[PDB]
């Protein structure tokens, strides 16, 4: 499972590009995550976005594992 910690790390990596649209996969190999701001949260200021309530998540598999 893509850990919450790993998802939080990714959200901080893309803290500038995080948006209402699905992001790229967080990993090149293995089970990563795609995140977006929930539609109902799009108007919250950046510093008030909550991990549990405001971020939608979805598993993504990549296989650049050579």
């Amino acid at each position, epitope marked *: 499972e893509p850990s*919450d*910690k790993h998802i*939080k*790390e990714y*959200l*901080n990596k893309i*803290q500038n590009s995080l948006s209402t649209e699905w992001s790229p996969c967080s990993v090149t190999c293995g089970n990563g995550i795609q995140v977006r701001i929930k539609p109902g949260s799009a108007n919250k*200021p*950046k*510093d*008030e*976005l*909550d*991990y549990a309530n405001d*971020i939608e998540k979805k598993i993504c598999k990549m296989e650049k594992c050579s």
Partner: antibody, heavy 120, light 107 residues
Framework: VHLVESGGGLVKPGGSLRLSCAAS????????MNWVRQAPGKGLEWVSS????????YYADSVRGRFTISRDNAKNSLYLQMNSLRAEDSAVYYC??????????????WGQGTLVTVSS | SYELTQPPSVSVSPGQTASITCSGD??????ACWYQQKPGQSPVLVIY???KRPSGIPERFSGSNSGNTATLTISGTQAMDEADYYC?????????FGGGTKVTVLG
């Protein structure tokens, strides 16, 4: 980026005092801000945090119900209203800016601090 | 976290590696941060989000967070690194600081 605290001084046991923190060099209105304190010769103790919009406010258990954090995004200033003060509350009070997102938070800038002395 | 435990004091000679641990229930799930405080001065961030170094911090400072222990390591500890060091994590919106660790440089 500058954080300048003010308002420290003598207060009698059971008394009140208001601290201020004037911020410069960044978009104050977009950051969560915090008060942290440090008794003489002892460790750091978080006091309170206030979100940009003042919607999300939290307090340490040690001060809950006696202290009130607030901000005037207008004057790029943060405030801490302290009431029913005790000697245990004597400390340097620091203004600190929160950075990071999604539980990966840290304080990247601190003020020089203002000293509060609670004494008869 | 909700109770972070660092050793009161750490002593080393110049040039050797100083290690400060910071212990907390489930701390591996959190993001540890480290602050240096010299006497009479405000804290300075040296490590954030477990392992990242602010732009102006020397490379000899490093951080790790595994299991339930975060560690600050100063390689080639210099006399200028003498200071109090505080670990810090978030829990339930409550910001928790460790008790602080004074590093003494011997000799």
């Amino acid at each position: 980026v500058h954080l300048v605290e003010s308002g420290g001084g003598l207060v009698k046991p059971g008394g009140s005092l208001r601290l201020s923190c004037a911020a410069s060099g960044f978009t104050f209105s977009s950051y969560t801000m915090n008060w942290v304190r440090q008794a003489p010769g002892k460790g750091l103790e978080w006091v309170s945090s206030i979100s940009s919009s003042s919607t999300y406010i939290y307090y340490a258990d040690s001060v809950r119900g006696r202290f009130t954090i607030s901000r005037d995004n207008a004057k790029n200033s943060l405030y801490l209203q302290m009431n029913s003060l005790r000697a245990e509350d004597s400390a340097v009070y620091y203004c600190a800016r929160r950075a990071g997102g999604f539980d990966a938070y840290y304080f990247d800038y601190w003020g020089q601090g203002t000293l509060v002395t609670v004494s008869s | 976290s909700y109770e972070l435990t660092q050793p009161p004091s750490v002593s080393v000679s110049p040039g050797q590696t100083a290690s400060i641990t910071c212990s907390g229930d489930k701390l591996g799930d959190k993001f540890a941060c480290w602050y240096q405080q010299k006497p009479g001065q405000s804290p300075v961030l040296v490590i954030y989000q477990d392992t990242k170094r602010p732009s102006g911090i020397p490379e000899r400072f490093s951080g790790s967070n595994s299991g339930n222990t975060a560690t600050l390591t100063i390689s080639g500890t210099q006399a200028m690194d003498e200071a109090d060091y505080y670990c810090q994590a978030w829990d339930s919106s409550t910001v928790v600081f460790g008790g602080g660790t004074k590093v003494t440089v011997l000799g």
